[PDB]
Amino acid sequence: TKKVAIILANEFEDIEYSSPKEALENAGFNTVVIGDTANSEVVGKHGEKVTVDVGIAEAKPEDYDALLIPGGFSPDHLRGDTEGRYGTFAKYFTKNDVPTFAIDHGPQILIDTDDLKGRTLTAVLNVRKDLSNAGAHVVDESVVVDNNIVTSRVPDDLDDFNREIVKQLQL
Amino acid sequence: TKKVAIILANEFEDIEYSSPKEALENAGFNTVVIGDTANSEVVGKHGEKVTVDVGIAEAKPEDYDALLIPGGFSPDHLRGDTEGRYGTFAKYFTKNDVPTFAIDHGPQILIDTDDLKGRTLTAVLNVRKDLSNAGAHVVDESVVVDNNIVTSRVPDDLDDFNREIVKQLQL
């Protein structure tokens, strides 16, 4: 069975967690929350409470068949890690062409892989300039699929996002 | 006289608004809050309420002698402006070498000027990579002064930040 790593800090956009999680699980895939401390709780911008399954220090990226990065301010928090561990984690996925799903602010973590040069991505308007500064070809579409990397901008994009991420994993 | 434009959205870091505002006003300078709509109220991430003085649609950067950008998630919201009007507002200050003060996440708005290449600044760890990708020389110091641009990282830097921003205006 295929299993998706979801990297999560506080103040994630609740629905950008719950909606892709439900779409993946409905397609038969499992999901695992990776955050600072196993068994700690992170809380969405709108109060959703999620328990972290696996600590970032223990997580083995090769265990997972895809990476999901919900938006809101969770990505910004993750990029506060003094050792940059979430960028390093994401880099396994970008370096090995493993399905990598990132919505809204989620693509901010992909900047930290240094692997975006010549990749085609969208994201929330707020961060598009930083994606372009990281060398991405940035567009403004509801979903963008560049081989393994699937990106979307906002919660209104979820239908399109969800349908692409599940297709990616079916391969 | 001397008037400092403070660009502000919801979820600013309260003290990064109030402490520089108070230093500037102690030293005899006026502050004007620039936001989406004149006379509306924005609320800090710890609850502080601020009235917007001047709407970004009306505001003319030439009218001001400095720009102050408090951090928290305010800069992120401002960068979400559909027409990019807060970046455009900042461009006046960076092009014309007017005193420009940004703390914590505040330098994220300076990215949108496209004027950071070769400039030296600091910011909160979370956004340094994006400043480097924008061509800035990023360092980790409590306050950095590059001609007109004064930056700092976190609220603990505020004594150093405040000293430098007031020194700019006296000069």
Chain A CB within 8 Å of residue B102 CB: no
What does the radius of gyration of chain B's CA atoms come to, in whole angstroms? 14
* Planar angle of CA B34, B37, B40, nearest 5 degrees: 95
Contact A125 B80 (CB under 8 A): yes
How determined? X-ray
Q: Are A110 and A94 in contact (CB under 8 A)?
A: yes
Residues near B158 by beta carbon (within 8 Å), at least 6 away in sequence: B15, B16, B19, B20, B103, B152
**DSSP letter string over B97-154?**
T--EEEETTTHHHHHTTT--TT-EE---HHHHHHHHHTT-EE---S-EEETTEEEE-S
Chain A CB within 8 Å of residue B3 CB: no
Question: Among A82, A111, A127, whose Cβ lies nearest the Cβ of B129?
Answer: A111
Bridge partners (DSSP) listed for residue B61: none
Bridge partners (DSSP) listed for residue A102: A69, A151
CA distance A101 to A7: 11
Q: Do you know the residue count of chain A?
A: 171
CA distance A124 to A9: 18
CA distance B77 to B81: 7
- Selected for mutation to probe chain B from A112, A132, A133 (highest B CB count within 10 Å) is A133
Helix, coil or strand: residue B10: coil
Q: All domains of chain B, ordered by start, with CATH?
A: 1-171 (3.40.50.880)
Helix, coil or strand: residue B66: strand
The experimental resolution of this structure, in angstroms, equals 1.8
Q: Are B43 and B16 in contact (CB under 8 A)?
A: no
Q: Which residues of B are catalytic?
A: 105
Shortest Cα–Cα distance, B84 to chain A (Å): 9
CA distance A29 to A23: 9
CA distance B153 to B20: 14
DSSP B58: T
* Planar angle of CA B59, B108, B75, nearest 5 degrees: 55
B-chain CB neighbours of A82 within 8 Å are 125
CA distance B107 to B56: 18
Count of C-beta atoms within a 10 Å radius of residue B46: 11
A-chain CB neighbours of B129 within 8 Å are 79, 111-112
Residue A37, token pair as written in the block? 């401390």
CA distance A61 to A64: 6
CA distance B107 to A154: 24
Q: Are strands A49-51 and A41-43 parallel, antiparallel or unpaired?
A: antiparallel
Q: Any idea which residue has 């969405």 for tokens?
A: A44
Closest residue, chain B, to A125 (C-alpha): B80
Count of C-beta atoms within a 10 Å radius of residue A80: 14
Q: H/E/C letters for each residue in chain A?
A: CCEEEEECCCCECHHHHHHHHHHHHHCCCEEEEEECCCCCEEECCCCCEEECCEECCCCCHHHCCEEEECCECHHHHHCCCCCCHHHHHHHHHHHCCCCEEEECCCHHHHHCCCCCCCCEECCCHHHHHHHHHCCCEECCCCCEEECCEEEECCHHHHHHHHHHHHHHHHC
Backbone angles phi, psi at B3, to 5 degrees: -125, 125
A-chain CB neighbours of B76 within 8 Å are 73, 76, 126
Q: Do you know the residue count of chain B?
A: 171
Q: Are strands B144-146 and B149-152 parallel, antiparallel or unpaired?
A: antiparallel
Q: Which residues of A are catalytic?
A: 105
CA distance A110 to A116: 7
Question: Among B77, B124, B130, whose Cβ lies nearest the Cβ of A130?
Answer: B130
Chain B CB within 8 Å of residue A112 CB: yes
Q: Minimal CA–CA distance to A126: which of A28, A19, A10, A13?
A: A13
Closest residue, chain B, to A127 (C-alpha): B79
Chain B CB within 8 Å of residue A80 CB: yes
The one-letter amino acid code at A132 reads S
Q: Are B125 and B115 in contact (CB under 8 A)?
A: no
Shortest Cα–Cα distance, B50 to chain A (Å): 21
* Planar angle of CA B38, B40, B41, nearest 5 degrees: 135
Q: Are B87 and B79 in contact (CB under 8 A)?
A: yes
